[PDB]
Amino acid sequence: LPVVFEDVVLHQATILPKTGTVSLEVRLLEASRAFEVSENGNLVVSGKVYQWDDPDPRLFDHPESPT
Amino acid sequence: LPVVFEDVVLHQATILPKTGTVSLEVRLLEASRAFEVSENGNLVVSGKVYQWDDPDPRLFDHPESPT
């Protein structure tokens, strides 16, 4: 599954404890091509995610070197 | 529940068939205070919905008419 992300915004940073676990929830909206990552009801990541219908390998050719 | 909407956008109009039914699916993102109604995987309404924490009846007073 090639994928394309867009307008990713990181609202906060989740600190992993030494002992114990932290749960993250991902909710998708296929109709709106959106997504959402949450931790105890607090938005932690937002943006747009959808499948790349027509991949183009040309996109991965190395660009002209700045120097 | 005193609710507050914001940035409601109607995308396509749903025609109600004379004979049959149309299924509207409503998904919420409580973390982002956002909602999206969909019809057969197509977006119909997008916006924000959230509970009105502090209702103020003064908001419903009738503004003085310009005429």
Q: Which method resolved this structure?
A: cryo-EM
Q: How far apart are CA A7 and CA A42, in angstroms?
A: 19
**Please, which residues bridge with residue B15 across strands?**
none
Residues of B in contact with A42 (CB under 8 A): 31
Order across the sheet with A3-10: list the strands.
A3-10, A42-51, A34-39, A25-29
Contacts 24+ apart (CB under 8 A), A7-11: A7/A46, A7/A47, A7/A48, A8/A45, A8/A46, A8/A47, A9/A45, A9/A46, A9/A47, A10/A44, A10/A45, A11/A43, A11/A44, A11/A45, A11/A46
Nearest CA in chain B to A47: B32
Residues of B in contact with A32 (CB under 8 A): 36, 43, 46
